[PDB]
Amino acid sequence: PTHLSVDTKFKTEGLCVDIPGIPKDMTYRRLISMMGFKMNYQVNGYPNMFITREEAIRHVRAWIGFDVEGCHGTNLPLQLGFSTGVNLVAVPTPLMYKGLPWNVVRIKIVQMLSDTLKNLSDRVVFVLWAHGFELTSMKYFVKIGPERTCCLCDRRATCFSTASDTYACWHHSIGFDYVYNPFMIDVQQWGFTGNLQSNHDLYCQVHGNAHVASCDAIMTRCLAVHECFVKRVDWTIEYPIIGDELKINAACRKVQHMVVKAALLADKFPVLHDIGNPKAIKCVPQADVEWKFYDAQPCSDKAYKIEELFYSYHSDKFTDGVCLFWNCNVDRYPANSIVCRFDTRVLSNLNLPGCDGGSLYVNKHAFHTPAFDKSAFVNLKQLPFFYYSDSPCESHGIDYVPLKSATCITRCNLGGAVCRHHANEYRLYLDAYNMMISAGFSLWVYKQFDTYNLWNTFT
Ligand SMILES: CN[C@@H]1CCN(c2ccccc2F)C1=O
Ligand SMILES: [Zn+2]
Ligand SMILES: [Zn+2]
Ligand SMILES: [Zn+2]
């Protein structure tokens, strides 16, 4: 049991206004046939156009919300809306395009999906709130068959070209006109009461209803993300490497060690309250400080209220020493904090649009993160870049240009001239730092933090 059986029942109540008289008793097998597709009893990797909720979650990077509204049924124009904000008008003869025949509309669909998905996934999952016209419009831009590979590479085929009779992945599909072997899921099958807008608006105020197909496409995908990543959370699901995941994660570990070690050296806190991941390890194992851990899983819905984390009776005195909130999203950080907070607004292949201002950050695991809020940091300041090292000035074991920098906090720089080892380490650290920042992470610190206090650790 890994794929959705074509013999599974499909509830047709949501389809009966666009498709009156539709049988109540319906399987995916009969629905696919009604949609104009023929599966021919084929054991060639594509057993069903529709997928399970579990398969959808594993392929969240492929999710594209899709809605079709009757602009005026083979006689009337249709408005095709996608969660990319694109609206296309197809004539049978928030971007809004004028009415065009299907032969040109399909070319645009292939281009749009290929540009959106080439760096995210090997497929497309059309996320629907199915009412009928979206399912019956698929025959005009979708072709199905056995699983195939690209004509220019080893990736699976996602597009087909009627001009050349060839197949391509999202990277090699320029000029292609058909979407090939797409996947889809109807959110209405999950058991909801009431329409799309009433269910979406229970959890999100950021997506409105401008009464266009793309607005519905966006709401449908948002509702699906809420159900699968906000109200339900699964950290056992692994996702493939598609970008700088490893470098970002290594950079995060380096920056955490650097910043915490320097805060302990500069202000000599007697106790550190480490709030967050219950599997956290001391990031500065050699520090003398009394290290105390507090368990809090990553919040996926709203940011934690500092009152619930700290109060209701632990050192108890979180006001003593310093608090470390490394990716532990809270409404308002205390003044004595060291913080790393993911900025949900960041544009990247790892960060997908989410629910209610939040974003779905996918790096090995999927983490829905509450919307970034500048007011959470009112008691702190932005942590400036610096590099600190107490290691001996010794090269050991890549060419050189001497380093001159006021932020290279080392014995050699204090002495007037940065050594080769600390210049190499400073540059590697600055690269790791910029990688983590560009990935969306923001760093905040207690207002008294001053790197000038680090120079006297060299005596
Ligand atoms: C006497 N206290 C020692 C001095 C060095 N130190 C320390 C070392 C590495 C990282 C952070 C630190 F605070 C202490 O805790
Ligand atoms: Zn290819
Ligand atoms: Zn929404
Ligand atoms: Zn040095």
Coordinates of all heavy atoms in Angstrom, one line a residue, residues 270-315, unseen atoms left out:
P270 N 26.9 33.6 34.5 CA 27.1 32.4 35.3 C 26.1 31.2 34.9 O 26.4 30.1 35.2 CB 26.7 32.9 36.7 CG 25.8 34.0 36.5 CD 26.1 34.7 35.2
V271 N 25.0 31.5 34.2 CA 24.0 30.5 33.8 C 23.5 30.9 32.4 O 23.4 32.0 32.0 CB 22.9 30.3 34.9 CG1 22.2 31.6 35.2 CG2 21.9 29.2 34.4
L272 N 23.3 29.8 31.6 CA 22.7 29.9 30.2 C 21.4 29.0 30.2 O 21.5 27.8 30.5 CB 23.7 29.5 29.2 CG 23.2 29.6 27.7 CD1 24.3 30.0 26.8 CD2 22.5 28.3 27.2
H273 N 20.3 29.6 29.8 CA 19.0 28.9 29.6 C 18.8 28.6 28.2 O 18.5 29.6 27.4 CB 17.8 29.8 30.2 CG 18.1 30.3 31.6 ND1 17.8 29.6 32.7 CD2 18.6 31.5 31.9 CE1 18.1 30.3 33.7 NE2 18.6 31.5 33.3
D274 N 19.0 27.4 27.8 CA 18.9 26.9 26.4 C 17.5 26.4 26.1 O 17.1 25.3 26.4 CB 20.0 25.8 26.1 CG 20.4 25.7 24.7 OD1 19.6 26.2 23.8 OD2 21.5 25.1 24.4
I275 N 16.7 27.3 25.4 CA 15.3 27.0 25.1 C 15.1 26.6 23.7 O 15.4 27.3 22.8 CB 14.4 28.2 25.5 CG1 14.7 28.6 27.0 CG2 12.9 27.8 25.4 CD1 15.1 30.0 27.1
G276 N 14.5 25.4 23.5 CA 14.3 24.9 22.2 C 14.3 23.4 22.0 O 13.9 22.7 22.9
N277 N 14.8 22.9 20.9 CA 14.9 21.5 20.5 C 15.3 20.6 21.7 O 16.4 20.7 22.2 CB 15.9 21.3 19.3 CG 15.5 20.0 18.6 OD1 15.9 18.9 19.1 ND2 14.8 20.1 17.6
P278 N 14.4 19.7 22.0 CA 14.7 18.8 23.2 C 15.9 17.9 22.9 O 16.4 17.2 23.9 CB 13.4 18.0 23.4 CG 12.6 18.2 22.2 CD 13.0 19.4 21.5
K279 N 16.4 17.8 21.7 CA 17.6 17.0 21.4 C 18.9 17.9 21.3 O 19.9 17.4 20.9 CB 17.5 16.2 20.1 CG 16.3 15.3 20.0 CD 16.2 14.3 21.3 CE 17.3 13.3 21.4 NZ 17.3 12.8 22.8
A280 N 18.8 19.2 21.8 CA 20.0 20.1 21.7 C 21.1 19.6 22.6 O 20.9 18.9 23.6 CB 19.6 21.5 22.2
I281 N 22.3 19.8 22.1 CA 23.6 19.5 22.7 C 24.2 20.9 23.0 O 24.0 21.9 22.4 CB 24.4 18.8 21.5 CG1 23.9 17.3 21.3 CG2 25.9 18.9 21.7 CD1 24.3 16.4 22.5
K282 N 25.1 20.9 24.1 CA 25.8 22.2 24.4 C 26.6 22.7 23.2 O 27.5 21.9 22.7 CB 26.8 22.0 25.6 CG 26.2 21.9 26.9 CD 27.3 22.2 28.0 CE 27.1 21.3 29.2 NZ 28.2 21.6 30.2
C283 N 26.3 23.9 22.6 CA 27.1 24.3 21.5 C 28.5 24.8 21.8 O 29.3 25.0 20.9 CB 26.3 25.4 20.7 SG 25.8 26.8 21.7
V284 N 28.8 25.1 23.1 CA 30.1 25.5 23.6 C 30.5 24.6 24.7 O 30.4 24.9 25.9 CB 30.2 27.0 24.0 CG1 31.6 27.4 24.2 CG2 29.6 27.9 22.9
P285 N 30.8 23.3 24.4 CA 31.1 22.3 25.5 C 32.2 22.7 26.4 O 32.2 22.2 27.6 CB 31.5 21.1 24.7 CG 31.8 21.5 23.3 CD 30.9 22.7 23.1
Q286 N 33.2 23.5 26.0 CA 34.3 23.9 27.0 C 33.9 25.0 27.9 O 34.7 25.3 28.9 CB 35.6 24.2 26.2 CG 36.0 23.0 25.3 CD 36.3 21.7 26.0 OE1 37.1 21.7 26.9 NE2 35.5 20.7 25.7
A287 N 32.8 25.7 27.7 CA 32.4 26.9 28.6 C 32.2 26.4 30.0 O 31.6 25.4 30.3 CB 31.3 27.6 28.0
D288 N 32.6 27.3 31.0 CA 32.4 27.0 32.4 C 31.0 27.1 32.9 O 30.6 26.5 33.9 CB 33.3 28.0 33.2 CG 33.9 27.5 34.5 OD1 33.4 26.5 35.0 OD2 34.8 28.1 35.0
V289 N 30.2 28.0 32.3 CA 28.8 28.3 32.5 C 27.9 27.1 33.0 O 28.1 26.0 32.5 CB 28.2 29.0 31.3 CG1 28.0 28.1 30.1 CG2 26.9 29.8 31.7
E290 N 26.9 27.4 33.8 CA 25.9 26.4 34.2 C 24.9 26.3 33.0 O 24.2 27.3 32.8 CB 25.2 26.8 35.5 CG 24.1 25.8 35.9 CD 23.6 26.0 37.3 OE1 23.7 27.1 37.8 OE2 23.0 25.0 37.8
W291 N 24.9 25.2 32.3 CA 24.1 25.1 31.1 C 22.8 24.3 31.4 O 22.8 23.2 31.8 CB 24.8 24.2 30.0 CG 24.4 24.6 28.6 CD1 23.3 24.3 28.0 CD2 25.3 25.3 27.7 NE1 23.3 24.8 26.7 CE2 24.5 25.4 26.5 CE3 26.5 25.9 27.7 CZ2 25.0 26.0 25.4 CZ3 27.0 26.5 26.6 CH2 26.3 26.6 25.4
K292 N 21.6 25.0 31.3 CA 20.3 24.4 31.6 C 19.4 24.3 30.4 O 19.3 25.4 29.7 CB 19.6 25.2 32.7 CG 20.4 25.3 34.0 CD 19.6 26.0 35.1 CE 20.1 25.9 36.5 NZ 19.1 26.2 37.5
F293 N 18.9 23.2 30.1 CA 18.0 23.0 28.9 C 16.5 23.0 29.2 O 16.1 22.4 30.2 CB 18.4 21.7 28.2 CG 19.8 21.6 27.6 CD1 20.8 21.0 28.2 CD2 20.0 22.1 26.3 CE1 22.1 20.9 27.6 CE2 21.2 22.0 25.7 CZ 22.3 21.4 26.4
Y294 N 15.8 23.5 28.3 CA 14.3 23.6 28.4 C 13.8 23.1 27.0 O 14.3 23.5 26.0 CB 13.8 25.0 28.7 CG 14.5 25.5 30.0 CD1 15.7 26.2 30.0 CD2 13.8 25.4 31.2 CE1 16.3 26.6 31.2 CE2 14.5 25.8 32.4 CZ 15.7 26.4 32.4 OH 16.3 26.8 33.5
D295 N 12.9 22.1 27.1 CA 12.3 21.5 25.9 C 11.2 22.2 25.3 O 10.1 22.4 25.9 CB 11.8 20.1 26.3 CG 12.9 19.1 26.8 OD1 14.1 19.5 26.7 OD2 12.5 18.0 27.2
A296 N 11.3 22.5 24.0 CA 10.2 23.1 23.2 C 10.5 22.7 21.8 O 11.5 23.0 21.2 CB 10.2 24.6 23.3
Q297 N 9.5 21.9 21.2 CA 9.5 21.5 19.8 C 9.4 22.8 18.9 O 8.9 23.8 19.4 CB 8.4 20.5 19.5 CG 8.6 19.2 20.2 CD 9.7 18.4 19.6 OE1 10.5 18.8 18.8 NE2 9.9 17.2 20.1
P298 N 9.8 22.7 17.6 CA 9.6 23.9 16.8 C 8.1 24.2 16.6 O 7.3 23.3 16.4 CB 10.2 23.5 15.4 CG 11.1 22.3 15.7 CD 10.4 21.6 16.9
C299 N 7.7 25.5 16.9 CA 6.3 25.8 16.8 C 5.9 26.0 15.3 O 6.7 26.6 14.6 CB 5.9 27.1 17.6 SG 6.9 28.5 17.2
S300 N 4.8 25.4 14.9 CA 4.5 25.5 13.5 C 3.2 26.3 13.2 O 3.0 26.7 12.0 CB 4.2 24.1 12.9 OG 3.3 23.3 13.6
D301 N 2.5 26.7 14.2 CA 1.2 27.4 14.1 C 1.5 28.9 14.4 O 1.8 29.7 13.6 CB 0.1 26.8 14.9 CG -1.3 27.3 14.5 OD1 -1.4 28.3 13.9 OD2 -2.3 26.6 14.9
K302 N 1.4 29.3 15.7 CA 1.7 30.6 16.2 C 3.0 30.6 17.0 O 3.4 29.5 17.5 CB 0.6 31.2 17.1 CG -0.8 31.3 16.3 CD -0.9 32.6 15.5 CE -0.5 32.4 14.0 NZ 0.7 33.2 13.6
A303 N 3.7 31.7 17.1 CA 4.9 31.7 17.9 C 4.6 31.5 19.4 O 3.5 31.9 19.8 CB 5.6 33.1 17.8
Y304 N 5.5 30.8 20.1 CA 5.2 30.6 21.5 C 5.1 31.9 22.3 O 5.8 32.8 22.0 CB 6.4 29.8 22.2 CG 6.5 28.4 21.8 CD1 7.6 27.9 21.1 CD2 5.5 27.5 22.2 CE1 7.7 26.6 20.7 CE2 5.6 26.1 21.8 CZ 6.7 25.7 21.0 OH 6.7 24.4 20.6
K305 N 4.2 31.9 23.3 CA 4.1 33.1 24.1 C 5.2 32.9 25.2 O 5.2 31.9 25.9 CB 2.7 33.1 24.8 CG 1.5 33.4 23.8 CD 0.2 33.3 24.5 CE -1.0 33.0 23.6 NZ -2.2 32.7 24.4
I306 N 6.0 33.9 25.4 CA 7.1 33.9 26.4 C 6.5 33.6 27.8 O 7.1 32.9 28.7 CB 8.0 35.1 26.4 CG1 9.3 35.0 27.2 CG2 7.2 36.4 26.8 CD1 10.3 33.9 26.5
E307 N 5.2 34.1 28.1 CA 4.6 33.9 29.3 C 4.3 32.4 29.6 O 4.6 31.9 30.7 CB 3.2 34.6 29.4 CG 3.2 36.0 28.8 CD 4.2 37.0 29.3 OE1 4.6 37.0 30.5 OE2 4.6 37.9 28.5
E308 N 3.9 31.6 28.5 CA 3.7 30.1 28.7 C 5.0 29.4 28.8 O 5.1 28.4 29.6 CB 2.8 29.5 27.7 CG 3.3 29.5 26.2 CD 2.3 29.1 25.2 OE1 1.3 28.6 25.5 OE2 2.6 29.4 24.0
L309 N 6.1 29.8 28.1 CA 7.4 29.1 28.2 C 8.1 29.3 29.6 O 8.6 28.3 30.1 CB 8.3 29.6 27.1 CG 8.1 29.2 25.7 CD1 9.2 29.8 24.8 CD2 8.2 27.7 25.6
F310 N 8.0 30.5 30.1 CA 8.7 30.9 31.3 C 7.9 30.9 32.6 O 8.5 30.7 33.7 CB 9.4 32.3 31.2 CG 10.6 32.4 30.3 CD1 11.0 31.3 29.6 CD2 11.3 33.6 30.3 CE1 12.2 31.4 28.8 CE2 12.4 33.7 29.5 CZ 12.9 32.6 28.7
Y311 N 6.6 31.1 32.5 CA 5.8 31.2 33.7 C 4.9 29.9 33.9 O 4.9 29.0 33.1 CB 5.1 32.5 33.8 CG 6.0 33.7 33.7 CD1 6.0 34.6 32.6 CD2 7.2 33.8 34.5 CE1 6.9 35.6 32.4 CE2 8.1 34.7 34.3 CZ 8.0 35.6 33.3 OH 8.9 36.6 33.1
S312 N 4.2 29.9 35.1 CA 3.4 28.8 35.6 C 4.4 27.8 36.4 O 4.2 26.6 36.3 CB 2.7 28.0 34.5 OG 1.9 28.9 33.7
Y313 N 5.3 28.4 37.2 CA 6.2 27.8 38.1 C 7.2 26.8 37.4 O 8.3 26.6 37.9 CB 5.6 27.2 39.4 CG 6.4 27.4 40.6 CD1 7.1 28.6 40.8 CD2 6.6 26.4 41.6 CE1 7.9 28.8 42.0 CE2 7.3 26.6 42.7 CZ 8.0 27.8 42.9 OH 8.7 28.0 44.0
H314 N 14.2 23.7 36.6 CA 14.4 25.1 36.1 C 15.1 25.9 37.1 O 14.8 25.8 38.3 CB 13.0 25.7 35.8
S315 N 16.0 26.8 36.6 CA 16.6 27.8 37.5 C 15.5 28.7 38.1 O 15.6 29.4 39.1 CB 17.6 28.6 36.8

